[PDB]
Structure formats: structure tokens, C-alpha cells
Curated annotation (Swiss-Prot), chains A, B, C, D, E:
The basal body constitutes a major portion of the flagellar organelle and consists of four rings (L,P,S, and M) mounted on a central rod. The M ring is integral to the inner membrane of the cell and may be connected to the flagellar rod via the S ring. The S (supramembrane ring) lies just distal to the M ring. The L and P rings lie in the outer membrane and the periplasmic space, respectively. The gene is fliF. It comes from Salmonella typhimurium (strain LT2 / SGSC1412 / ATCC 700720). It is found in: Cell inner membrane; Bacterial flagellum basal body. Induction: Inhibited in nutrient-poor medium. This is Flagellar M-ring protein. Residues 75-86 have a biased composition (Polar residues). It comes from the Bacteria. Belongs to the FliF family. The M ring may be actively involved in energy transduction.
Length: 151, 151, 151, 151, 151
């Protein structure tokens, strides 16, 4: 039950090593630190969709029987019985979702001075980090990069 | 049953080490302390949703039979029997939620003086810490950072 | 059956060590004492919700059959039988709540003099302690901090 | 359960080696770095489509029986019973999807200076990298190439 | 489960060796590099079509019985019962698709200078590579050839 903590530390070490080894070429070998807080999903979570295609349209129905009596007298006392049996296009996914996905990432990046870095270089550094995390606004990952003199 | 206390201490040690090793570059090697109080959920908690898609709309129903008699005399003594059988798109999630999530985080950060730190630096330090915890206003995590001379 | 007393003493020792090691940087190494009285819930307490989604709205019902006869003569002696069978979205949580939660916390904090401490420093010390306990007005935790010369 | 992390590191090492060994001819042996963040799908995920071809059109139906009584008196009290049985063209795919696909790729490319590289060379380098990843806007792969002097 | 990565590397090595050993005669023994990113389909995927030929046309039906009563009185109170039984031409394919097809190819080709190569030679080199991959716009294979001085 501490294996989960070891595992999340492994994931954060991977992404942290990645950001450091991708941004070390630009800023310097030791002028950058990153600590990534990965919240991981450890819920066992199956799922079983079962979709059917709507066969409401008679031009894409698929009958198997059709017993269609049409009486008609003429006091136009008509009639129209109409049985049917259809066949249905049925998809059945049976997912057994993963134990250990990343629900969300949080990355904090500090980059040393040189003199404050230029704004364009800051934008492109943010973009590199955004690609190195695997940033996904779907998961709501949040990245914060700052430049401030070290000590 | 003390394994839970050891486990929560492990989680708080991880997040505390994280905040210290992310903010140590800026403020100094020992000019920051953080103690994180993690309340963890240890309830066994399964769950079994079972959703069905509304097949009220005849254009997305999926019949399997339809026995549709329509008598009509003319004293317009009509009639319209209409049996049906449908087929339904049925999802079945079976979650077995995790034992040891973080229900909420509480972080207290103290940062040493230098002379009181500037307000902009304080904002950016708060943001770094907010990313290092994995701050989520969903869980109602609460962070409090203060700057005050040590002893 | 004394394991419960050992356990509650463990929890109070953790939170007390936490408050002491978070406020020791500010006030001094030995100018603060805290004794935390944790009332813990040791009741075995399961739970089994079982929610259903209201399928009163015909636009989100999910039929499985519908046998809908509509006779009508004209003395407008009408009729409308209307059977139905529905399918229902059914969630089933099966919680087995924890044995050893904290029902409530009570923290008493004494901080030594220096000359009485300033009021702003007192507010921020109260806030640090409030975060270090894991204060939750939901549990009705109560914190009382006082400054008064030691002996 | 760490085999997944080893596996994803393997995939990223393959694609990173590929980009480096395809762009090393142009920019130089060590004037390029690439770190590829591959998010992999590890869900067990079966699937069973079952399509039927619409036999609504009588010119492409395939009867097996047809009991077609047509009474007619002349007060033109006609009648037309018409049973049927059809046969249906039924496809049955049974996929057992892969464990370890790439849901998405993220590539960050840094290329050293020479003097900033020309824009046309930058476009063609981006295109080479786009082919070396196996870029697919279907998966939403994201590539970011930048040129900036190393250190 | 790493056998898939070894296998895809094998396929890419085959196609890369092929492009190199087909274009080496023209451009030179070492004036060309190619790295081919093959995305392979590893899904188990069966399939079972079952087609029937439409026997709607009476001139290509194939009866097995036909019980065809035709009463007729003359008040022309006619009648025409007409049973039938047909026989149907039924094809049954049972595919068990391959594990390891190439869903898509991506080829990046770099060719050294000599002075930039002529445009006609570039077109014919692109065509040779297009044949050496086994280019198929059905799979959406993508090829990108560029000429740029090496280093």
C-alpha cells in the first residue's frame, strides 16, 4: 500500500528527469529545477458500453420477419396490421481501465538568471516544458514556470 | 491499524520534501519550512453505475419487435394498437475506489527574511507552492504562506 | 482495547510534533507548547447507498416495452391504454467507513513572550496552526492560541 | 506494474533515437535533442461489432419463405395477407484491441545555432521530425521544434 | 510485450535497408539516410461476413416448394394464395486478420548535396522511394524527401 507512493514517485521522477534533460541544453546544466506533482488514479474501474444502432429508419432497418396484412373494404372500413421483427447492430466494448493513469499533472519550473531572461525565450521555454510534461488541458494539467535568481 | 498513520506520514513527507526541494532554489537551502497535513480517505468504497441511454426519441430507438395494428372504419370508429420491444444501450461501470486518496491537503509555509520579501516574489512563491502540493480547489486544499523572521 | 488509547496518543503526537516543528522556526526552538486532544471514531460503520435516476421525464425515460392501444369512436367514447416497462440507471455505493477517523480536534497552543507578541504576528501564527492541525470547521475542530509568559 | 513505466520509456527511447538519427545528418552529430512524451493506452479493451445489411429494399432482400394470399371480391372488399421470412447478411468482428498503443505523442525538439537557422530549413526540419515521430493529427500528437543557442 | 517493439524495429529496419540499398546506386554509398516510422496493428481481429444473394427477382429465385392456389369466381370474387419456399446462395467468409500489419508508414529521406540536386532527379528519387516503401495512399503512408548539405 506504499507501493502506490513509490509508483507515483517513479512517475514524477521520470517527468522531472525529462524536463531537466530537455531544458538543460538551453538554460545550462544546473540552472533549472522542476518538481512535478502527479496525482494518479488507482481505482479499479471496469466499463461495459453496449451501443445499438437506431433502426428507426425503414431504409436502414433489417427485418427478419414481416407479417403485413392489409384488409380494405369499400364505409371505407380499412385495416392494416403490420408485425415486424428486426435485427440490430450491436457493439459491445468491455473496457477494464488502467490502474495508475495520471488524473492530473502539476509542474513547477524555476530557471536561473543570466539578468532576467527575455520574454520570447520565456515563452519558448514554457512551450518546451508544456511538450515535455505531455501537457493536456483535458486532464487540467497546470504548469507554472518562473525565472528568479538562485542562491 | 497504525499502518494508516505511517502511511499518512509518508504522504506528508513526500509533499513536504517536494515543496522544500522546489522552493529551496529560490529562498535558500534552509530558509523555508513546510508541514503538510494530509487527511486521507481510507474507506473501502465500491460503486456500480448503470446508465441507459434514453430511447424516448423514435429516431434513435432500436426496436426488436413492433406489432402495429391499425383498424379504421368510417362514425369514424378508428383504432391503433401498437406493441413494441426496444433494445437499450447500457453502460456498466464497476468502480472499486482507492484506499488512501487524499481527501484534502493543508499546507503551511514559512519563509525566512532577507528585510521582508517583495510582494511579487511572494505571489510567485505562493504559485510555485500551489503547483508543488498539487493544489485542487475541488478537494478544498488550503495553502497558507507567510514570511516572518526566524530565530 | 487499550490499543485505541495508544492509537489516539499516536495521532495526537503526530499533530503535536507537526505544530511544534512548524511554529518552532518563528517563535523559537522551545518557546511553544501544543497539546492536541483528538476524539477518534472507532465505530465499525458500513453503508450502502443505492440511488436511481428519476425517469419521470419521458424525454429521458428508457423503455424496454410499450404496449400502447388507442381506441377511439365517434358520443366520443375514446380510450387509451398504455402499458410500459422502464430501465433505470442505478448506482450502488458500498462504503465500509474507516475505523479511526478524527471526529474532532482540539488544539491548545501556548507561545512564550519575547514583551507580548504583536497582534498581526498572532493572527498569522493562528493561521499557521490552523493549517498544521488540518483545521476543518466541518468536524468542528477548535483551536485556542494564547501568549503568556512562561516560568 | 512498473513494467508499464519501463515500456513507455522504451517507446520514447525508440522515437527519440529515431528523431536524433534522422536529424543528426542535417544539423550535426550533437546539435539536436529531442524528448518524446508518449502517453500509452494500457486498457484491456475488447469489442464485438455485429452489422447487418439493411434488407429494406425488396430488390436486395433474400427471402426464405413467402406466403402471399391475395383475396379480392367485387363493394371492392379486397385483402392482401403477406407473410415473409428473410435471411440477413451478418458481419461479426471480434476485436481484442492492443495493450500498449500510443494514445498521443508529444515531441519537443531543440536544435543548436550555427546564427539562427533559416526559416525554410526550419520548415523542412519540422517536416522531417513530423514524419519521424509518425505524426498523426488523429491521435492529436503535438510537435514543437525550436532553435536556440546551447550552453 | 516488448516483442512488439522488437518486431516494429525489425519492420522499420527492413524498409530502411531497402530504401538505402535502392537509392545508394544513384546518390552514393553514404549520401542518403532514411528512418521509417511504422505504426503496426497488433489487434486480434476476427471477422465473419455472411452474404446472401438477393433472390427478389423471380427469374433468379430458386424455389423448393410453391403452393399456388388461384380461385376465381364470376361479382368477380377472385383469390390468389401463393406460398413459397426459396433456397439462397450463401457465402460465408471467416477471416482471422493478421497480427502485425502496417496501419501506416512514415518515411523521412535526407539526401546529401553534390550544389543542390536537380528537380527532375528529385522527382524520380521520390518515385523510387515511393515504390521502395510500398507506398499506399490507402494506408495514408506519408513520405517526405529533402536534400540538404550534411555535416
Amino acid at each position: 500500500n506504499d507501493a502506490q507512493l513509490k509508483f507515483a514517485n517513479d512517475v514524477e521522477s521520470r517527468i522531472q528527469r525529462r524536463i531537466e534533460a530537455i531544458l538543460s541544453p538551453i538554460v545550462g546544466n544546473g540552472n533549472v529545477h522542476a518538481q512535478v506533482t502527479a496525482q494518479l488514479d488507482f481505482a479499479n474501474k471496469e466499463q461495459t458500453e453496449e451501443h445499438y444502432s437506431p433502426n428507426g429508419d425503414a431504409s436502414k432497418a433489417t427485418l427478419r420477419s414481416r407479417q403485413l396484412n392489409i384488409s380494405e373494404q369499400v364505409p371505407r372500413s380499412t385495416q392494416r396490421n403490420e408485425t415486424s421483427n428486426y435485427e440490430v447492430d450491436r457493439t459491445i466494448r468491455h473496457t477494464k481501465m488502467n490502474v495508475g493513469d495520471i488524473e492530473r499533472l502539476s509542474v513547477a519550473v524555476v530557471v536561473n538568471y543570466k539578468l532576467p531572461l527575455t520574454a520570447d525565450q520565456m515563452k519558448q521555454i514554457e512551450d518546451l516544458t508544456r511538450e515535455a510534461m505531455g501537457f493536456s488541458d483535458k486532464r487540467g494539467d497546470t504548469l507554472n514556470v518562473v525565472n528568479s535568481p538562485f542562491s
